[PDB]
Amino acid sequence: FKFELSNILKGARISVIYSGGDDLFLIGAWDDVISKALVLRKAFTRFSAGKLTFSAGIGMYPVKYPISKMASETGVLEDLAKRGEKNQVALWNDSKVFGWSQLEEQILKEKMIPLQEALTNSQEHGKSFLYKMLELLRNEDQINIARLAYLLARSSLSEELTQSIFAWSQNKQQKVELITAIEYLVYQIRE
């Protein structure tokens, strides 16, 4: 905790408020924070030989946000992650408590990367189209699934990608991952 964290977090916009005992408090750029949280999980799995697991809470706040509120809400997220198997990471709210491999692979390496690569070609980066996808995904109507299918048809992107997105939205526990990936991409392309 007191030595290896500096080596792990190398080359990231991150300040370590504390690191000792078994707890850890980091504040930085949100994308850097999530990437280094995944890297820390991997390095901790390597260090403890798989015998020890840790849970995490990641909050995203504006600058000038109350620091006490930041700490309290991130602690609430962490305590949310410490439930049941308690080997989880909470992301930005109580409805995004994922597993570590689920967040790294099933959310970022599987859903966010293909969509980001496809939407980089778009002139507007797909901000409005991603907003429409979020609007359609939040609702839970079958006719709205039809609207989502029409939007994917009119997206003018890879057909296999539209099929994958439609399947992901159809499946529960994969629609939450899809929504998280869409929101992460929206945050990445913004001002």
Binding site: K64, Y65, P66, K69, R83
Partner: protein
């Protein structure tokens, strides 16, 4: 409750109880102040931390006293529904409706006798009772602070004297009767801090 006092609540049961509370959602509303804009200035945002209750959730409490005190509290609560409790009452917070009734479910517990006493309110005893009521006690000191909300206490708004009170849930083997302390510092009127003890007896 009693099962917890007898030690028959497991750690998993404690976690289930903790997650079974369905009070509500705490949020932070960001507001702005445009008063400086009209004076060639800038807007000043601020934050108000609110808590909204679920449709059938709320806050209850127990009142003890004679018939006259109970009736006066009925009128006071009826007016307090529209006065509001908490922070920005005049800015759209703290409005509620209250119902006052009997409590058989709580009279079953308040008639219970035991070897330990549990505080149901933030209380503290005078020195004479504090001499003998603190043995084998398990408590939690809370620092009661704040500004005096009054239009006649002084010219400008000032804080009241720092107070320290035992928390709710503190267990004592001696039941102390608290009082209403004065946290006023040479003001026009005496600012009161209620620290009387509402007790719940139990078996450990």
């Amino acid at each position: 409750y009693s099962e917890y006092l007898r030690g028959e609540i497991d750690s998993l049961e404690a976690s289930k109880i903790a997650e079974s509370l369905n009070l509500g959602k705490a949020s932070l509303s960001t507001k702005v102040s445009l008063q400086a804009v009209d004076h060639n200035g800038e807007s000043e945002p601020y934050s108000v931390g609110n808590f909204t209750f679920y449709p059938e959730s709320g806050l209850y409490f127990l009142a003890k006293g004679n018939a006259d005190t109970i009736g006066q509290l009925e009128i006071l609560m009826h007016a307090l529904q529209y006065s509001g409790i908490g922070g920005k009452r005049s800015a759209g917070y703290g409005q509620f409706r209250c119902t006052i009734e009997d409590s058989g479910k709580f009279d079953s517990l308040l008639s219970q006798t035991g070897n330990i006493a549990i505080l149901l309110s933030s209380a503290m005893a005078s020195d004479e009772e504090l001499v003998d009521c603190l043995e084998d006690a398990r408590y939690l000191l809370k620092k009661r602070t704040g500004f005096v909300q009054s239009k006649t206490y002084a010219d400008q708004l000032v804080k009241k004297k720092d107070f320290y009170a035992f928390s709710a849930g503190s267990t004592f083997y001696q039941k102390f009767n608290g009082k209403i302390f004065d946290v006023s510092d040479n003001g026009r009127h005496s600012v009161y801090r209620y620290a009387k003890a509402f007790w719940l007896e139990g078996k450990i």
